[PDB]
Amino acid sequence: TAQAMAKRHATLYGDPAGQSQASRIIDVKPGMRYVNVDSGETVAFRAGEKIVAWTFAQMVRDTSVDLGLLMPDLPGSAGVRVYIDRSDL
Amino acid sequence: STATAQAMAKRHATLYGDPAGQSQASRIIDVKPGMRYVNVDSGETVAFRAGEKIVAWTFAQMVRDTSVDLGLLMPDLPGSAGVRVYIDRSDLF
Ligand SMILES: [Cl-]
Ligand SMILES: [Cl-]
Ligand SMILES: [Cl-]
Ligand SMILES: [Cl-]
Ligand SMILES: [Cl-]
Ligand SMILES: [Cl-]
Ligand SMILES: [Cl-]
Ligand SMILES: [Cl-]
Ligand SMILES: [Cl-]
Ligand SMILES: [Cl-]
Ligand SMILES: [Cu+2]
Ligand SMILES: [Cu+2]
Ligand SMILES: [Cu+2]
Ligand SMILES: [Mg+2]
């Protein structure tokens, strides 16, 4: 599937995480434009009662990705940009 | 004493950037009860919203990652105190 391809591309940016492990919850709202996350940060993203969390990978350069690539089932995710900061490692 | 503390808070905030207009901000962050931190870049201009009150800031260029309490930057934005802004290091160094 195209979903399998997308899942593979999303892996470049980290891995799904349990919600319990996030250090903050970001509410995904209409028109928010973007968020900023660090390499290694675990962030939960919430739309109503749905919550999906993610641990970002160690990026070799500052990069960005569409939240809808990482969490297509989260309402409102598509079009929100995630800027991920380069790893200090 | 409240007046003097207000004056030192403004000095402290000036170490972290400058007041900005909302028309130059690249995003508006809603400040909701319970919020603990947000991440901004050195140099980013961000507007912060509580209800329909919006206050914007341009973050300084920091030599290393640092944080500041948003309530010291914008004491008149209700709910700002206790939200910590994490400011990533500048690429200008
Ligand atoms: Cl948006
Ligand atoms: Cl953020
Ligand atoms: Cl859920
Ligand atoms: Cl990378
Ligand atoms: Cl970079
Ligand atoms: Cl998802
Ligand atoms: Cl926005
Ligand atoms: Cl640093
Ligand atoms: Cl502080
Ligand atoms: Cl203020
Ligand atoms: Cu590809
Ligand atoms: Cu950085
Ligand atoms: Cu100070
Ligand atoms: Mg950084």
Side-chain angles (χ1 to χ4, degrees):
Chain A
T1 61
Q3 280 174 344
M5 294 161 167
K7 183 170 303 154
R8 199 176 279 284
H9 276 80
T11 301
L12 194 62
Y13 304 97
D15 305 292
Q19 211 260 299
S20 79
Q21 296 305 111
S23 48
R24 54 169 166 161
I25 308 179
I26 293 181
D27 281 293
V28 179
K29 63 180 172 177
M32 71 185 304
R33 298 184 182 269
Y34 68 88
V35 305
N36 289 352
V37 305
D38 217 337
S39 275
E41 193 184 351
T42 301
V43 183
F45 291 90
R46 171 162 66 201
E49 271 162 317
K50 194 168 170 68
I51 307 182
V52 177
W54 190 263
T55 302
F56 290 94
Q58 299 296 324
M59 305 277 113
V60 312
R61 69 180 70 169
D62 286 357
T63 335
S64 69
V65 63
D66 199 284
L67 190 62
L69 176 71
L70 308 186
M71 48 196 71
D73 295 331
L74 185 72
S77 68
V80 178
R81 186 147 234 69
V82 181
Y83 286 95
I84 304 166
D85 192 36
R86 167 174 61 132
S87 177
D88 16 319
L89 275 40
Chain B
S1 58
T2 311
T4 297
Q6 266 176 345
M8 288 293 105
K10 174 191 183 296
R11 274 185 69 77
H12 181 76
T14 297
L15 298 171
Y16 292 91
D18 297 288
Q22 179 197 345
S23 68
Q24 287 294 307
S26 43
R27 59 172 164 161
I28 295 171
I29 290 178
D30 201 5
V31 170
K32 281 311 192 99
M35 176 166 303
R36 294 279 282 265
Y37 69 95
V38 294
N39 291 338
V40 303
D41 290 328
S42 279
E44 194 181 354
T45 299
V46 180
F48 293 86
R49 162 163 235 107
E52 306 300 328
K53 192 177 194 345
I54 299 169
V55 177
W57 190 263
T58 302
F59 290 93
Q61 298 291 337
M62 301 306 190
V63 69
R64 59 182 64 87
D65 295 2
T66 186
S67 74
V68 62
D69 197 289
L70 187 63
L72 300 181
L73 307 187
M74 47 194 71
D76 290 336
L77 187 74
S80 60
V83 179
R84 195 151 278 272
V85 185
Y86 190 108
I87 304 160
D88 184 44
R89 169 170 152 35
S90 176
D91 67 356
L92 302 179
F93 294 95

